[PDB]
Amino acid sequence: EAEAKAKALEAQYRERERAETEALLARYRERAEAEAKAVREKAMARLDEAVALVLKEVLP
Amino acid sequence: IPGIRAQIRFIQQVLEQREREDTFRLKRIKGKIEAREAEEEGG
Amino acid sequence: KKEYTGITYISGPLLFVENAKDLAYGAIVDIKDGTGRVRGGQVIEVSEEYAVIQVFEETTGLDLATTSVSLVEDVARLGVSKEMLGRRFNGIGKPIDGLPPITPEKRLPITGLPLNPVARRKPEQFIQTGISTIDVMNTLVRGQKLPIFSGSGLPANEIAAQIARQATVRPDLSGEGEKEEPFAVVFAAMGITQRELSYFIQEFERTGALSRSVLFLNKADDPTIERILTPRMALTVAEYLAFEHDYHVLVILTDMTNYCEALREIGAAREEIPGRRGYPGYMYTDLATIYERAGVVEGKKGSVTQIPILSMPDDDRTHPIPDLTGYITEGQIQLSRELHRKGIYPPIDPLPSLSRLMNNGVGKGKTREDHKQVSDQLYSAYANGVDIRKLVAIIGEDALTENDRRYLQFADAFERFFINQGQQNRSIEESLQIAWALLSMLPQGELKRISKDHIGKYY
Amino acid sequence: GELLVATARTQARGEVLEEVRRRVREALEALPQKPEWPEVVRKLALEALEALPGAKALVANPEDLPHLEAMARERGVELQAEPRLGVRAVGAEGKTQVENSLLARMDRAWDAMSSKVAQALWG
Amino acid sequence: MIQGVIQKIAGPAVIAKGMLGARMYDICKVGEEGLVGEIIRLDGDTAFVQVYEDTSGLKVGEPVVSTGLPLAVELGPGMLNGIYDGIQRPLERIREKTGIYITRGVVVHALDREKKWAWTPMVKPGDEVRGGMVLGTVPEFGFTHKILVPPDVRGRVKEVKPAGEYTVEEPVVVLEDGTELKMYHTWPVRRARPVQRKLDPNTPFLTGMRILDVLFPVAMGGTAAIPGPFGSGKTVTQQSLAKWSNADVVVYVGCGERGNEMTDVLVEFPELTDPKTGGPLMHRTVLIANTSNMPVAAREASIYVGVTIAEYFRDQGFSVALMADSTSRWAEALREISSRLEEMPAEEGYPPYLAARLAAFYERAGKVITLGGEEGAVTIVGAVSPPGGDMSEPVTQSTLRIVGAFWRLDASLAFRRHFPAINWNGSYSLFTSALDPWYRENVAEDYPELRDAISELLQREAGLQEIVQLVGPDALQDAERLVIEVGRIIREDFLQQNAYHEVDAYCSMKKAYGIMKMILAFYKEAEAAIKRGVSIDEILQLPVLERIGRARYVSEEEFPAYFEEAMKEIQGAFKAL
Amino acid sequence: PVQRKLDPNTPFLTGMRILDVLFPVAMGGTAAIPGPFGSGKTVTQQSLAKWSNADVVVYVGCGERGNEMTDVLVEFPELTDPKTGGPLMHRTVLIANTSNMPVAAREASIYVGVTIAEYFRDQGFSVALMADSTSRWAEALREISSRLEEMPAEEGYPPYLAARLAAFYERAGKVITLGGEEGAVTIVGAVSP
């Protein structure tokens, strides 16, 4: 029964581990998509300026 | 032991000196090619 | 972009193109033809009226009629972004990460000369590994160049990236913390096969274990030329990491056999005057010059721990390649066929294997003062026992005395249990425990390369 | 997880940065037909002209070279042939043929300052 | 292309003229003996001739006019069955136009542009297709070979011909780019085919034997190697692999060959029973022979032709079984160049291009999913002649970490009954650990165990070996001759394989398995005998040892029941005594 | 020059008994010792010199590994010359050479100490030549001799295979210098396998 009880632990140990680690991914990924967007968004506004600047070096 | 030592001993060296020639033979060739042909910075 | 045609003469990987007054050694330019095709070639041996380019392509869809040079950049060498860290690379490094290019925080010529003679300082600090045996018998410290003698069809390779990922830079036990030690894992392969290449993707990529690492790796498939420079990258880059911005670094080579194999080809044509094994000295040179990134420079605890990693073929130091190493490097760590066969993980030889400097970072409650004699306990304790092991069909565990019969049994428990460990990531302290235990099988009437006092602390 | 976020952002910034590059590049291709364009011609035409100590003729496309009157008079006194996104020069025998592409200039500034330009964007 | 005739009568690697703008490595038409060149160095208008074909008429002013393009295999119908020169010339056509003797300038046309071969429309016009996309069916055998879009040759359809027997170069789709897919394509050897993405082994090839099929299990998509010494095993140790393979397409290619042995390959494949079919092994074999009398560059060609096929097929998911007849002659072929080209080779006359001429090429493919969306198992069999014999040839070290398996061949070992009795440490196939999943189910979970079980003894036995050589069984602990003798059967029925001992013509997983228990048992029963105190002699003198001694005399089918008795006969000739 | 070279036949004191008792030194010759890795040979050179019997200390590397190539410097004042009271470093010219060093760096390394020694020697000063991997010096020589038209058509050894060797040892003894005094010019050849 010291083996048995521990067997009963194991289930949960794999399950809870699975469920959470798998869940952690959801949280990260779906936040990754978002955070990726937010550096795009910072640029969007002040973006034009970049083109303008870059264009200016190349032009003469 | 000491016999079988001496074998290696023999080998080695014999292999080795051959190896001079490699270069020596090839070398002389290099000299030719380069002497006729290495004057492209002159023309 | 300075054009020059005047390609006269196209031989093998070499190429003349006229001019060569304007050029500074170690140069590269794109020759583009009618197809405009890019082939790439270092501009080597600048003559005067011509150059010598050593291109790397195939010269087909190529026209002597239209040739030129878009002057690319002679002394081209990397930029650098130490914070570009999610990077994964092939050879020289074009994104195998596929992530958008670095921010050249600085720009690094890959050569610059190593350290200062007056910079370096003799070792003084251990670093744990996640492996047992390779911390006990031979004990990892920072600024240590530990060659790891591999052989042919072996899983050296595995035990590399394996113990790689296990690793965590550590000196907690000494009385210091671990907060201010950045851990820089720099990884570099070469000559990678389809199979192997994915094992890579497996480890880093396993979880985010690239969470502290970069790949760089010139396939066999890839040109042997670009190959050469491959290390020089992370070599140079590594400085910028720890020496310029403290990390506690890990040099991880790959059979540098390859470099040199690769080296050869260049010369074989270039008429590079031989040396031994036809191989002209400077192998000598270069090899020195690489691992001179060891030692602790003042103001930087962020010193690099080095692992030079190659194999001998006939597995003798006969080959220059180990010899060389074996003259300058601080150790030796071999692996046996037998060993792997016996399934010992790590499968690392005994007496053949040794960390030359390791007193310094150990002991003193950093791993116990007792680590010392534990190291020479088990050495001789073990080694004796293989005497027994090897006299067995002659005289078995009968003719034997008890003690020595235990020293057969010691050996058995030593190899099987300690040195094999599979993939378990032991802890340095968790490694020492074992030691005690195994030795406990033998009486203290059969222990003495540790004081009884100390052995009784863990008996 | 942190590593997934990190890639995501860095990746994202590239998509932006590349866009800005493209617009300039695209812009540089709408330049040969501009009204302020003949003027630009001879700038790059001159730039190339400095680079060759030899000379022969100054070559640029239609939508380029015809406009050039400055060095249609000067240099080789010609408006010979056509290669637009640059002006190149010829002179002093072969092997000297140097260019200065508008797009190689793009690639010059772009390739470098993928850093400062990125700064102009973020920060 | 660029016009020239012989400018400077100078070797069979001559100097042409009028050849500026030249593309190195480009096929040409040269002279009048059907002669053809390769741009093998440049000097503006004057060009380094690579000379394939012979002359005995080298003089000045003889054509040397390039093509500005370079080499190509006519890929498509007709390859399977019927020999192909290293020129990819169906030697039949030649023989019919030559005679018994071979004669050049006899250009023949590789595929039948003059025969009627079925086709099928399957697509639509006003629509389009990309590379590697099915078109119709030209057939031949149950090894039916539809035709796909050749890639790099991919556009918008405009018609789709009605099914019908047509010539191979007949278009059968014309495209709205005015272009036309036809049923075959000549294609540069040098160019290497793209794919959808790289796939990797985990599945094991089986060459129907035991050594390299369990003891060094062969990987499906594998890579391999063998130095087979001089008049000392290789060739004849390589053919049965052909007729014991799970190949989709067998690709027999031999280079530099001895004519006679290909009068025992080429004319023997008809009289080979395809088991996946019935008739000629030539059903899925092309046959691509080249000899050493046949030129040097043909000697190269050979190789690079079966690459192309391998790729062509790989796309089409065909599980290439290529087996290469030693490169070393090839090596020589390059390396004789060096001298004549007045060059500084790599060591002892080894051309310097080596890595160059090996390495990319070898790691081109092996079980790799394609744009054909199928797994072409480019399973390639590297053979080497160690002409020095030395276990230290360049060629070796370069082989390192490129093959998947490697083995070496002892001669007086092999001169005996067991050809090939080799050192397994004179070998290694690390390509064997990823097949363990697959084995675990497929054969069994102790199918990988039981192979581990052998090796334990086999290398530890060396342990003992030395002491043998330090005295021999002459009063040494009763573990002795246990092992010794054990190992004997382990090579004798268990791995002494022969096509000719037709009882052991083939060997299976399960057969091997059977065995793996047969013996195991006998061993086991020896353990508890001797532990009980038994002297091994009588264990020696067991008939059931001979019952296992029929185990290469026991074919696979027979095996189940055969073995099932012997596990008893063991115990009867063991527990008892 | 030094006028006559006379008889070095007064032995060199080293302060460790048995050594000189067993195999003494004279005072300006050519000695040797092997001793590679493990059993820290460095022991000797430190203690040796500590007592010595020379009034000048001379050292360099040629192949010695980085940190250790710095170690020397460190151990110098640790060595207490009670003659001076303070450091042995007092009577110490130091030269060095790791191994990454410039080509002719290594080649000169040697030459340095030797030349200089004579200076002092000529002035009446007992100098103290030692050795770090004498054998490894030669490595470099091979390298050097490599890149040349010539070669070790010797046996993988630089031609001038007694050349550099010679003067290196011929120069020594109990000189009656130009200054008329003497400078003890003891050398120990640690080719140290």
Ligand SMILES: Nc1ncnc2c1ncn2[C@@H]1O[C@H](COP(=O)(O)OP(=O)(O)O)[C@@H](O)[C@H]1O
């Ligand atoms: N499995 C085998 N059983 C018997 N003989 C074999 C076997 N495999 C190879 N041989 C022997 O190989 C000999 C010839 O060598 P071969 O294998 O053709 O290669 P090589 O060209 O390297 O000599 C044959 O005479 C044949 O007896």
